[PDB]
PDB file of C-alpha atoms and ligand atoms in Angstrom:
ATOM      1  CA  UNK A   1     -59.887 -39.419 -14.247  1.00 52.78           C
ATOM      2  CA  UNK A   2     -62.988 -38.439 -16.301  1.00 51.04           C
ATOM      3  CA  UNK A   3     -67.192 -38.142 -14.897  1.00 51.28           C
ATOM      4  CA  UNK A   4     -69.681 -38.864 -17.246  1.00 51.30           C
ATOM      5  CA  UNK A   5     -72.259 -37.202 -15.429  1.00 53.88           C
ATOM      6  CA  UNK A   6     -70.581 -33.646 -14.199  1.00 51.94           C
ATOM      7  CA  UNK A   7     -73.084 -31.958 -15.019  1.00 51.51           C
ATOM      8  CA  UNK A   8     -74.219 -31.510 -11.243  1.00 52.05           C
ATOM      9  CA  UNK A   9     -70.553 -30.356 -10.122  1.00 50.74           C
ATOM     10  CA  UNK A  10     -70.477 -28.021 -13.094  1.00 48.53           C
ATOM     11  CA  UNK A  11     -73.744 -26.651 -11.457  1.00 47.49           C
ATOM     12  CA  UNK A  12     -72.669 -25.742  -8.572  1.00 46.56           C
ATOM     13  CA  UNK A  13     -69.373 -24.669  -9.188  1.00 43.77           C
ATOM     14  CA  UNK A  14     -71.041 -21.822 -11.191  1.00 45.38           C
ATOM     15  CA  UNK A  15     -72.969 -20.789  -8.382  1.00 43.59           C
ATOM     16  CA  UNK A  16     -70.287 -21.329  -5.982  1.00 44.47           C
ATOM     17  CA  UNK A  17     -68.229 -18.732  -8.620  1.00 45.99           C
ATOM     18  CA  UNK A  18     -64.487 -20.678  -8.319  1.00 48.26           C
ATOM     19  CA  UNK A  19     -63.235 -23.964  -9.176  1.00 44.23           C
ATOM     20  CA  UNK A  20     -64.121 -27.012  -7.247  1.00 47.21           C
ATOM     21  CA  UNK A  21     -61.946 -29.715  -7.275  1.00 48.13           C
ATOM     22  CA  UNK A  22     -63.047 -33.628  -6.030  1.00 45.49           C
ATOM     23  CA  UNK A  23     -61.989 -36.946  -5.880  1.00 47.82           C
ATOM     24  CA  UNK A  24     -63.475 -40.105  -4.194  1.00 49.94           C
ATOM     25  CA  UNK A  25     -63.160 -43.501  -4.189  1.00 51.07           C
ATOM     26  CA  UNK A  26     -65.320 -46.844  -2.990  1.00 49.25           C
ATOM     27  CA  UNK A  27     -62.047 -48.906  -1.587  1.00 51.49           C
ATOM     28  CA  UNK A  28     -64.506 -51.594  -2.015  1.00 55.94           C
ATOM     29  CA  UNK A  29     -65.320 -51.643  -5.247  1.00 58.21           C
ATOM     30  CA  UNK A  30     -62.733 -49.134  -6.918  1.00 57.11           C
ATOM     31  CA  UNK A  31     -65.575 -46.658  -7.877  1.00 59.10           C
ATOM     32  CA  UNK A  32     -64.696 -43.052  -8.310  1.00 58.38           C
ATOM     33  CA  UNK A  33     -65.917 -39.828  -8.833  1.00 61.68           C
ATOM     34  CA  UNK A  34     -63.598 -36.825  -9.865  1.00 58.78           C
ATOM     35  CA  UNK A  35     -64.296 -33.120 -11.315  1.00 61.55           C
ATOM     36  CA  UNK A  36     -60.927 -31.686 -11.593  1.00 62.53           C
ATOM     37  CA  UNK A  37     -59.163 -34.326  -9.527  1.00 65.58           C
ATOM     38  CA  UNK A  38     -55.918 -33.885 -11.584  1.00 63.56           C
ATOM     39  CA  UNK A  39     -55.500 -30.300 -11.254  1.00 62.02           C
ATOM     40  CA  UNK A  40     -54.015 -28.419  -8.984  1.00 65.79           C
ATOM     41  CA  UNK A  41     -55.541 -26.544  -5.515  1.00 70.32           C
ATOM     42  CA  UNK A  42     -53.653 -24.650  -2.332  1.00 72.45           C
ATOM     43  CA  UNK A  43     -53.406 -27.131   0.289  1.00 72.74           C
ATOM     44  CA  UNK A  44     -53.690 -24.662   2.851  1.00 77.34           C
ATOM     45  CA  UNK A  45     -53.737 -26.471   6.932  1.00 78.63           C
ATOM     46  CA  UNK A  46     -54.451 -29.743   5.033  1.00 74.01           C
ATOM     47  CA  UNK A  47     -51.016 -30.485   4.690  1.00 75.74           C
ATOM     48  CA  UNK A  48     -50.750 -30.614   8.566  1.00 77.97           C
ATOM     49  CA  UNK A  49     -52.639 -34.085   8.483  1.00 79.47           C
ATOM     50  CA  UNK A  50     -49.772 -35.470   6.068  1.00 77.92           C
ATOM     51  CA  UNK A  51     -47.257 -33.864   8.264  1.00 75.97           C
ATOM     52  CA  UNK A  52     -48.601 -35.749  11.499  1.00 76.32           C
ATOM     53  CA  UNK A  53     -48.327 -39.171   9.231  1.00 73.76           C
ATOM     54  CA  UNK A  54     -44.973 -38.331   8.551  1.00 75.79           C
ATOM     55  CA  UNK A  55     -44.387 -38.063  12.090  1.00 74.18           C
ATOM     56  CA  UNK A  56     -45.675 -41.411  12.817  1.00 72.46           C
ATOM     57  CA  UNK A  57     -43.561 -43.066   9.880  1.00 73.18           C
ATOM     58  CA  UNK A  58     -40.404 -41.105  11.454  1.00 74.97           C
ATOM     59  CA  UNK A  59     -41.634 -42.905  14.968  1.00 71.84           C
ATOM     60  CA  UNK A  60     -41.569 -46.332  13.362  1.00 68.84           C
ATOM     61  CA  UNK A  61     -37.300 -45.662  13.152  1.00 67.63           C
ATOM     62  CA  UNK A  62     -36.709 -43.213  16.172  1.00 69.69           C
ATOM     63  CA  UNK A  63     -37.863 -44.873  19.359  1.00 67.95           C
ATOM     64  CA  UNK A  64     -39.196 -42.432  21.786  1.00 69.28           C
ATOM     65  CA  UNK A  65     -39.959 -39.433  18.928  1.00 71.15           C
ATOM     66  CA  UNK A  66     -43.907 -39.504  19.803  1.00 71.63           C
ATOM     67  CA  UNK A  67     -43.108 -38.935  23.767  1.00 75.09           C
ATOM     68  CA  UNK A  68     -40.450 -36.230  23.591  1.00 73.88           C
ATOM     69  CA  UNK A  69     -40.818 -32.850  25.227  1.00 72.39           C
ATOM     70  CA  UNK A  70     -40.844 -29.681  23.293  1.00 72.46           C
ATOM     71  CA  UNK A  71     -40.441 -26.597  25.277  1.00 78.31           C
ATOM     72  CA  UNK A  72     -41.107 -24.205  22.914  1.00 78.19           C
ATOM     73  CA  UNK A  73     -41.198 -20.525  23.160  1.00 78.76           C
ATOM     74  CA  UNK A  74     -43.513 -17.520  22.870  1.00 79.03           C
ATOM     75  CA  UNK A  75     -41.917 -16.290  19.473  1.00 76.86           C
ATOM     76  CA  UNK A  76     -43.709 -19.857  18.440  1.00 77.52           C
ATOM     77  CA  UNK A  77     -47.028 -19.195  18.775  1.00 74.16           C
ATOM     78  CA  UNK A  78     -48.402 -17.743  14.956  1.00 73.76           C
ATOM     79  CA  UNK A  79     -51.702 -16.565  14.813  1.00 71.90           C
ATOM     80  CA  UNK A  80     -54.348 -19.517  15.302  1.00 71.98           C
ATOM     81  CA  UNK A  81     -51.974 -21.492  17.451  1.00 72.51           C
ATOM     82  CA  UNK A  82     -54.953 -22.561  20.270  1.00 72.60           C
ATOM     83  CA  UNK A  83     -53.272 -25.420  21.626  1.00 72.29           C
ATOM     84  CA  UNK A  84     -49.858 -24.275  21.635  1.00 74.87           C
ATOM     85  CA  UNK A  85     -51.124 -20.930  23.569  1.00 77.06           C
ATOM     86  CA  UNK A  86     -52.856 -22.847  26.214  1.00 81.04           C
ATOM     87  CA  UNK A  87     -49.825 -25.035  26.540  1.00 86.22           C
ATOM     88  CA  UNK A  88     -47.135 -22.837  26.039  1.00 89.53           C
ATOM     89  CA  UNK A  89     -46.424 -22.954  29.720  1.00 88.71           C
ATOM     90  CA  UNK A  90     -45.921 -26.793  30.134  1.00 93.02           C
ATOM     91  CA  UNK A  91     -44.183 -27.863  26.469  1.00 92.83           C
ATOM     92  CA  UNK A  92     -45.800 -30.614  24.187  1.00 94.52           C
ATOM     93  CA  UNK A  93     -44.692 -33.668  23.386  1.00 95.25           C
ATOM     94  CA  UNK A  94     -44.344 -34.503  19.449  1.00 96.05           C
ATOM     95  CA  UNK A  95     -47.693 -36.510  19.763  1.00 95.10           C
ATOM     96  CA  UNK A  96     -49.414 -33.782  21.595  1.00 94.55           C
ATOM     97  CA  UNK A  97     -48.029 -31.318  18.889  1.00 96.57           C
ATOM     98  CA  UNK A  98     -49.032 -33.553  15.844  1.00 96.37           C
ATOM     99  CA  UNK A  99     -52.438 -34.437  17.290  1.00 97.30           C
ATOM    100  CA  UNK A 100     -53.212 -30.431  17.616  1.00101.00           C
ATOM    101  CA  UNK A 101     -52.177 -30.091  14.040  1.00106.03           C
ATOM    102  CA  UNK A 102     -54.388 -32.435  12.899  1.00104.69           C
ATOM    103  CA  UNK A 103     -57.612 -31.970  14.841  1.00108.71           C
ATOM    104  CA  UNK A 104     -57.550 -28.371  15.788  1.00110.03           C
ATOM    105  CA  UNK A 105     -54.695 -26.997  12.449  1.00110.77           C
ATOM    106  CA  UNK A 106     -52.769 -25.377  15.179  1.00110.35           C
ATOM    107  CA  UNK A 107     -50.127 -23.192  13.235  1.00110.29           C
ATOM    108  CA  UNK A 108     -47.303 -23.453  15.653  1.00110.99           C
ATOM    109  CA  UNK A 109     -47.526 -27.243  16.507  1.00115.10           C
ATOM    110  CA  UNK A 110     -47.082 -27.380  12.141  1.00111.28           C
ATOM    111  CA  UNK A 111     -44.208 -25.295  11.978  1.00109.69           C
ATOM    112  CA  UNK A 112     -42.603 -26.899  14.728  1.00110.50           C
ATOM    113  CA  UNK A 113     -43.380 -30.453  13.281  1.00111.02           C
ATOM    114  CA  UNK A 114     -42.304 -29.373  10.168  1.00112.49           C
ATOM    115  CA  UNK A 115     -38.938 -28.032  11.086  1.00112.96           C
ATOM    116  CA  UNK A 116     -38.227 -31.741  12.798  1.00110.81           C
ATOM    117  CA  UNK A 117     -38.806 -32.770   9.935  1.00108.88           C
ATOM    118  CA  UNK A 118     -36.790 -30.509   7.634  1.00108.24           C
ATOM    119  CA  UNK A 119     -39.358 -28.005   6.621  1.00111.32           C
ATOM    120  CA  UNK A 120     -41.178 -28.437   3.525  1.00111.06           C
ATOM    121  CA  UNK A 121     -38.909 -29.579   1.729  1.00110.35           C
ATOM    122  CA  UNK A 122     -38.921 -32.771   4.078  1.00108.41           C
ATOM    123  CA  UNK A 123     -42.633 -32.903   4.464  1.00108.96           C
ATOM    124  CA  UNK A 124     -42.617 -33.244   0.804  1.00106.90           C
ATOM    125  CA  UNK A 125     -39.658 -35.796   0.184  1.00105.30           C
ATOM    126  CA  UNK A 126     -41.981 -38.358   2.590  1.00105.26           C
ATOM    127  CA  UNK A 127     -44.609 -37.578   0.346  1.00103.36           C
ATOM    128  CA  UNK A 128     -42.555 -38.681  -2.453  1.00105.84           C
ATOM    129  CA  UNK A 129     -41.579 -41.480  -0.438  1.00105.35           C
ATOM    130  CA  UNK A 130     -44.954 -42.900  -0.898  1.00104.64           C
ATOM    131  CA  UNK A 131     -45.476 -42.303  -4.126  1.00100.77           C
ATOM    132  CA  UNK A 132     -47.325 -39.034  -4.358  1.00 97.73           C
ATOM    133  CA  UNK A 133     -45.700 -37.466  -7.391  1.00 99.15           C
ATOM    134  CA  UNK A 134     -48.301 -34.255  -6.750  1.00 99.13           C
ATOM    135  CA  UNK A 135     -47.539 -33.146  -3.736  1.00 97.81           C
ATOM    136  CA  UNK A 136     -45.734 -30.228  -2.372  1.00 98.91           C
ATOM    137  CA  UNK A 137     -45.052 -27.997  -0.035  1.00101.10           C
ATOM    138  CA  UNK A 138     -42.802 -24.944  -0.457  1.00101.48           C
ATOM    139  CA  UNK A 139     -43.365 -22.891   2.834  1.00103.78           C
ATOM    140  CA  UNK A 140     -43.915 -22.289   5.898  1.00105.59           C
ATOM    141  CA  UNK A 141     -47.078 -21.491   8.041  1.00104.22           C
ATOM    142  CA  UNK A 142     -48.399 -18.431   7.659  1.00109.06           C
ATOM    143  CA  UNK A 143     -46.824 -17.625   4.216  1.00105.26           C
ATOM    144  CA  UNK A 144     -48.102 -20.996   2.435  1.00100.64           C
ATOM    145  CA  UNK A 145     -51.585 -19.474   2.555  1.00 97.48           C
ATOM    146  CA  UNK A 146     -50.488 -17.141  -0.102  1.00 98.91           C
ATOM    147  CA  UNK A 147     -52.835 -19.193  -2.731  1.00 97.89           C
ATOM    148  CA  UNK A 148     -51.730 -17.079  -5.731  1.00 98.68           C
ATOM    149  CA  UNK A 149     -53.664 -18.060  -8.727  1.00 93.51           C
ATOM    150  CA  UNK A 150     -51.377 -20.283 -11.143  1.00 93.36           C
ATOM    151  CA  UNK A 151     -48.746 -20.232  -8.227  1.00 91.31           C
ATOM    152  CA  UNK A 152     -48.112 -23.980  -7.522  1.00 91.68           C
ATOM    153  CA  UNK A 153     -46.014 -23.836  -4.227  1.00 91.97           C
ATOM    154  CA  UNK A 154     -47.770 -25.627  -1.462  1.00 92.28           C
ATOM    155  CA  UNK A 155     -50.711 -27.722  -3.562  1.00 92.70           C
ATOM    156  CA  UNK A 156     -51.301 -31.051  -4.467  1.00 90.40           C
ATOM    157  CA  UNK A 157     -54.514 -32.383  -6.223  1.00 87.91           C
ATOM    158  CA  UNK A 158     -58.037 -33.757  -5.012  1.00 87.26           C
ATOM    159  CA  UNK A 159     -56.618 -37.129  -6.262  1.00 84.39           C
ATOM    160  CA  UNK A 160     -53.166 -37.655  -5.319  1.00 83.60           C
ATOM    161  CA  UNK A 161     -54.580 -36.238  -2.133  1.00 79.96           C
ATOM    162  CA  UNK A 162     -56.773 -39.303  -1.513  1.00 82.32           C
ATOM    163  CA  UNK A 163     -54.553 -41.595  -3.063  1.00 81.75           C
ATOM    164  CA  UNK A 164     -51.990 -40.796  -0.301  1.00 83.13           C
ATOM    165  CA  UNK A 165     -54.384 -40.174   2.370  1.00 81.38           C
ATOM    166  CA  UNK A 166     -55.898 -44.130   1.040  1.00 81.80           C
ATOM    167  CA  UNK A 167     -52.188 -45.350   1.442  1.00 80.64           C
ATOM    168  CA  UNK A 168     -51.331 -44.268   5.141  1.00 77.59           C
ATOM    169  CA  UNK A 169     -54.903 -44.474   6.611  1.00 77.89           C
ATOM    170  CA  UNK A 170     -56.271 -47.937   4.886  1.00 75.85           C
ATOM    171  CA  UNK A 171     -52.878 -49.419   3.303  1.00 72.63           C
ATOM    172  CA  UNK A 172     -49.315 -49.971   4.158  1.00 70.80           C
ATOM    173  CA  UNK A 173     -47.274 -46.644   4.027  1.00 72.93           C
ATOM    174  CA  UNK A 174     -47.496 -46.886   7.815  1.00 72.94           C
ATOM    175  CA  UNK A 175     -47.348 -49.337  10.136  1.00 72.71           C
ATOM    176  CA  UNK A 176     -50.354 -50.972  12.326  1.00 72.54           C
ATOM    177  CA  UNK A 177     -50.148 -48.374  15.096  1.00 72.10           C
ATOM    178  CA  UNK A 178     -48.821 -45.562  13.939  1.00 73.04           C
ATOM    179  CA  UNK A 179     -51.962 -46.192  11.083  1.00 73.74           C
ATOM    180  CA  UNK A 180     -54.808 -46.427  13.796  1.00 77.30           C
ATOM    181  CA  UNK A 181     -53.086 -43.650  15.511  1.00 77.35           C
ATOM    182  CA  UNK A 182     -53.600 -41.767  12.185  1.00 76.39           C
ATOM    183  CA  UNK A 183     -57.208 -42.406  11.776  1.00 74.35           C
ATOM    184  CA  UNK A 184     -57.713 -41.841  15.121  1.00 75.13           C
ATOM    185  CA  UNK A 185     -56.615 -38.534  15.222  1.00 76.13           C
ATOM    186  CA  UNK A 186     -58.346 -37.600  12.045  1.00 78.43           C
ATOM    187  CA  UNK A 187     -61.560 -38.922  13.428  1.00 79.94           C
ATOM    188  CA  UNK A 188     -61.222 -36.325  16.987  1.00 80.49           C
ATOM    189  CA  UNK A 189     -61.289 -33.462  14.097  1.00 82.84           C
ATOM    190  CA  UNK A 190     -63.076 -30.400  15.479  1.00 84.46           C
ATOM    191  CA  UNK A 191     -62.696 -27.952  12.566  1.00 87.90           C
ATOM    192  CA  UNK A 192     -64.658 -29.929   9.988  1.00 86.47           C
ATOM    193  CA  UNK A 193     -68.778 -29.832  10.896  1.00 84.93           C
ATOM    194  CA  UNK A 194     -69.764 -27.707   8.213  1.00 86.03           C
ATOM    195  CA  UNK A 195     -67.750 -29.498   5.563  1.00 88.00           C
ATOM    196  CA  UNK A 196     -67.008 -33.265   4.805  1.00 91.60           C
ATOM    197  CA  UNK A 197     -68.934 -34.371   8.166  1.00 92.79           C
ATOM    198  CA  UNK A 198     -71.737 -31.979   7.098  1.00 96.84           C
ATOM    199  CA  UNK A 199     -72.464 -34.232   4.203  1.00 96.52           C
ATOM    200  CA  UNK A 200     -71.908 -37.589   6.129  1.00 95.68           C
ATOM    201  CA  UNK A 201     -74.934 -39.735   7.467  1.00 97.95           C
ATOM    202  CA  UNK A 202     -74.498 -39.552  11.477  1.00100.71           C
ATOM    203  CA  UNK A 203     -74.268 -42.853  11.651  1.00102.24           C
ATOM    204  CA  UNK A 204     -70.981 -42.744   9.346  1.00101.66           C
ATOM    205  CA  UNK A 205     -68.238 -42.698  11.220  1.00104.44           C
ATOM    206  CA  UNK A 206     -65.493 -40.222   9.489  1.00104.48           C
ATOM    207  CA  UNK A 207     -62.042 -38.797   9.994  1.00105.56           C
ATOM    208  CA  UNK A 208     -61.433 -35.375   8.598  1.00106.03           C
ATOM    209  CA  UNK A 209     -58.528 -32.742   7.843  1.00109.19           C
ATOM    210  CA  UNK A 210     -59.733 -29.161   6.544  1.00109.67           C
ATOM    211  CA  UNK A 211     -57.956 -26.322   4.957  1.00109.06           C
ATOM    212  CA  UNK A 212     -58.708 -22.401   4.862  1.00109.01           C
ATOM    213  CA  UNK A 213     -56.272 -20.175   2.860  1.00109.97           C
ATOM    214  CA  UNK A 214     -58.292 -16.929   3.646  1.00110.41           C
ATOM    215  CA  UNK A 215     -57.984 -15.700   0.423  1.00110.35           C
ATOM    216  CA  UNK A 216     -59.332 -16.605  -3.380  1.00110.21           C
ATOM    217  CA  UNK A 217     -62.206 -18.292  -2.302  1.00107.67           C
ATOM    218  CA  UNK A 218     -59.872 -21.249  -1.396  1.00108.79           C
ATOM    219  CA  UNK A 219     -60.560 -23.746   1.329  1.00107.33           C
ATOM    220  CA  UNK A 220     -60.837 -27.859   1.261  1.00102.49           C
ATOM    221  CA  UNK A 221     -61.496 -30.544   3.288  1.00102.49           C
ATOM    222  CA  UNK A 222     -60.344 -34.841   2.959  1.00102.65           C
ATOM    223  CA  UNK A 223     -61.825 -37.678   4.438  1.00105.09           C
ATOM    224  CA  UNK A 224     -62.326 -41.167   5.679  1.00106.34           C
ATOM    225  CA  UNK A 225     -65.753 -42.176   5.486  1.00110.03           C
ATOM    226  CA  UNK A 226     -66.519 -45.605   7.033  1.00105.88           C
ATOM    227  CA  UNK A 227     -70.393 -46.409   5.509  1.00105.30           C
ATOM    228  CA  UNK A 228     -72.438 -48.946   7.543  1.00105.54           C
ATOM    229  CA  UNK A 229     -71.061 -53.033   6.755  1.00107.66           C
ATOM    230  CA  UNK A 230     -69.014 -51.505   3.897  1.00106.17           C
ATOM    231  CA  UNK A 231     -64.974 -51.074   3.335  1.00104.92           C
ATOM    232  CA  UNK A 232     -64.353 -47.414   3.279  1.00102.84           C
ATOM    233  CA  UNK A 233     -64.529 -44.177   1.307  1.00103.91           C
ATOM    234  CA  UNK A 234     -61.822 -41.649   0.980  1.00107.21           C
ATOM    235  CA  UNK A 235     -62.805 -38.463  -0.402  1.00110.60           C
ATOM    236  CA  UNK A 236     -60.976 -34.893  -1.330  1.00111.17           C
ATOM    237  CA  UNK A 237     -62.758 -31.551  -1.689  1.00112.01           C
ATOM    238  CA  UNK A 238     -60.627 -28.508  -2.672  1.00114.00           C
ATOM    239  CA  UNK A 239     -62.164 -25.079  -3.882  1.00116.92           C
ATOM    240  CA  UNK A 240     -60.268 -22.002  -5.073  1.00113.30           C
ATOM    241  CA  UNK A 241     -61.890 -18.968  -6.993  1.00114.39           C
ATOM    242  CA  UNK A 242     -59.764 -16.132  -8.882  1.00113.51           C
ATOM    243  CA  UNK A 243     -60.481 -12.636  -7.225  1.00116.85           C
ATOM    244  CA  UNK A 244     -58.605 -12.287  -3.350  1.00117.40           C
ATOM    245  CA  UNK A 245     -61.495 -11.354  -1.994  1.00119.17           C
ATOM    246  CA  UNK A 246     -63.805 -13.988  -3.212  1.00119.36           C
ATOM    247  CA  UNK A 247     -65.423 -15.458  -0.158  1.00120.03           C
ATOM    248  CA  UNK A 248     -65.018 -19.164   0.705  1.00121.49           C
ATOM    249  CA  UNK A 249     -67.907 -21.486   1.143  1.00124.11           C
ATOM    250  CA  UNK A 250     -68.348 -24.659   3.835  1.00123.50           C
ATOM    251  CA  UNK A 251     -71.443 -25.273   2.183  1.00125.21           C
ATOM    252  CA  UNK A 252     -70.017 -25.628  -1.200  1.00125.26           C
ATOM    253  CA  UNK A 253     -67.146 -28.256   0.147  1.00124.48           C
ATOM    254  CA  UNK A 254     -70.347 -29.893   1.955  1.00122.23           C
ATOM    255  CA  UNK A 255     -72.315 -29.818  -1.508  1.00120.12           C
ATOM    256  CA  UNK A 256     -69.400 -31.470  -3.424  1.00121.57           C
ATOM    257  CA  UNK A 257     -68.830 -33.931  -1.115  1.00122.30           C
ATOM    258  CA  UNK A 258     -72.620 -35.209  -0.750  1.00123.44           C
ATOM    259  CA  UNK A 259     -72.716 -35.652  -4.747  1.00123.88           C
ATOM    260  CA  UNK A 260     -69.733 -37.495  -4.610  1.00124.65           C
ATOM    261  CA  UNK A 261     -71.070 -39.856  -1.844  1.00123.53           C
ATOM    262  CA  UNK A 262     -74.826 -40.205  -3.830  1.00126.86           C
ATOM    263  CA  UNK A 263     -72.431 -40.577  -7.277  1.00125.03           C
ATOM    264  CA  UNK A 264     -71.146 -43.683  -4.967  1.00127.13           C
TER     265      UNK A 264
HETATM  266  B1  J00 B   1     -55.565 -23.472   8.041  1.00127.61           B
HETATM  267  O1  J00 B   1     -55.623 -23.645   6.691  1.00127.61           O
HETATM  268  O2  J00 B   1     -56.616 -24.220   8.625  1.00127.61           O
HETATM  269  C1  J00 B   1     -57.257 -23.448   9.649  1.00127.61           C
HETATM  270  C2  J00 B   1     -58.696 -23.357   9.302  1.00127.61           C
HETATM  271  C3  J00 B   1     -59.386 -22.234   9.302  1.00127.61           C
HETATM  272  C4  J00 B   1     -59.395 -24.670   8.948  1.00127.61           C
HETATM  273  O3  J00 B   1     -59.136 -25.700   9.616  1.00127.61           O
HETATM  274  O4  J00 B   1     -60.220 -24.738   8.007  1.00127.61           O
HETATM  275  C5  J00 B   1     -56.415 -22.167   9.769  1.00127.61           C
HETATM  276  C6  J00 B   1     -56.485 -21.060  10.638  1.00127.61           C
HETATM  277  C7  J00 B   1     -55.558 -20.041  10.543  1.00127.61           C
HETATM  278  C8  J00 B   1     -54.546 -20.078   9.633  1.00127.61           C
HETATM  279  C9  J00 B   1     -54.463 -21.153   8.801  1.00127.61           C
HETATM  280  C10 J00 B   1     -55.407 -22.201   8.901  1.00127.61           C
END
C-alpha cells in the first residue's frame, strides 16, 4: 500500500497531533487510497461489528442461535451498556444482543457475545478464518481500551480492516442472509454522525461501526459507502496519538475519510 499524493493526510495529521491511519477501496474499479493502512491502531468498540458477523457465520451451523434468550444479570451491565440496561429486565436474544453491539457499541451485549463465542481468542480465530492475518483481539470489554502505545493486543490495521469488512459485507465469508443482515445492521448505526457519515453525501447510503478508546487520542470509524449507480466503497479510519491525555477528534476521522472519498 503506498499514496503518491499524501501530502494532504500528512497535513492534517500534524494538526490533528497523532497518527491517522486509512484505507479505502472503489470495489468497482480496485482504486485505493491508504496513509498508514499497514500499521497498526487500537480497535477499540470496532471489533464489536466483526463480533456480530461472527455471530451470523456461527448461525449459518447452529439453527436457532440468532432467536435464543439470554437472561443475563445485573453484574453484566459495564459501563455504556444502554441497551442491555433498558433490557435487563426482559433478556435479549443473540440477535437483539449483536444488533446493540453493532449500532449502539453496547459493552455488555460484546462481552456476552464474545464469551459465546470463546472470548477473544475466538473472535479472533473467525477472523483468521477469513483470512485476516492482522487481526486481534486479546481482551475483554472494558480492559481492551487500554490503547498502550506500541502495545498490540486488541488492533488490527485500516487495511485488513476493510479487507475483512469487504469480505463479509460485499463477498462470500457469509452467507446471503446472514450478509444483508450484516449490512443492515451496520447501516441502523447511531454512534457514527460526526465521523464516516459526516463525510458522506446524504444521498449515500452508508453502514458504519465506530470506536472510542478514551485515551491517546485514539478513536476510528469503518464503512460501507454505497455512491449513487456505482458498486461500493469500503473505507477504514483509525487515529491514535502518543500522550493519554491527548484528546480525540470526530472531525479528524470525518477529514480523513472525505479525502479518501475525493482521492476516489
Ligand atoms: B467503544 O469503543 O465505542 C463506544 C464509543 C464511544 C463509540 O462508539 O465511538 C464506547 C463507549 C464506552 C466504552 C467503550 C466504547
Amino acid at each position: 500500500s503506498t499514496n503518491l499524493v499524501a501530502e494532504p493526510f500528512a497535513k492534517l495529521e500534524q494538526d490533528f497531533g497523532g497518527s491517522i491511519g486509512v484505507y479505502a477501496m472503489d470495489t468497482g474499479s480496485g482504486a485505493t487510497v491508504s496513509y498508514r493502512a499497514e500499521e497498526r491502531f487500537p480497535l477499540c468498540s470496532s471489533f464489536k461489528g466483526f463480533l456480530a458477523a461472527a455471530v451470523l457465520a456461527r448461525s449459518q451451523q447452529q439453527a436457532g442461535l440468532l432467536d435464543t434468550p439470554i437472561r443475563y444479570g445485573k453484574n453484566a451491565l459495564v459501563p455504556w451498556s444502554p441497551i442491555s440496561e433498558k433490557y435487563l429486565t426482559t433478556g435479549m436474544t443473540v440477535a437483539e444482543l449483536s444488533a446493540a453491539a453493532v449500532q449502539y457499541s453496547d459493552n455488555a451485549a460484546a462481552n456476552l457475545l464474545l464469551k459465546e463465542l470463546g472470548g477473544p481468542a475466538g473472535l479472533t480465530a473467525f477472523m483468521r478464518s477469513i483470512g485476516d492475518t492482522t487481526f486481534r483481539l486479546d481482551r475483554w470489554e472494558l480492559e481492551l481500551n487500554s490503547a498502550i502505545p506500541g502495545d498490540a493486543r486488541d488492533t488490527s490495521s485500516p487495511r485488513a480492516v476493510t479487507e475483512s469488512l469487504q469480505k463479509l459485507t460485499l463477498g462470500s465469508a457469509l452467507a446471503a442472509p446472514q450478509r444483508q443482515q450484516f449490512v443492515d445492521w451496520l447501516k441502523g448505526n447511531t454512534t457514527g454522525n460526526h465521523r464516516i457519515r459526516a463525510a458522506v453525501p446524504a444521498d449515500w447510503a452508508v453502514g458504519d461501526k465506530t470506536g472510542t478508546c478514551g485515551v491517546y487520542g485514539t478513536a476510528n470509524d469503518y464503512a460501507v459507502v454505497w455512491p449513487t449507480g456505482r458498486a461500493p466503497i469500503v473505507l477504514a479510519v483509525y487515529t491514535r496519538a502518543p500522550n493519554k491525555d491527548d484528546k480525540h477528534s470526530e472531525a479528524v476521522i470525518a477529514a480523513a475519510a472525505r479525502l479518501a472519498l475525493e482521492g476516489l
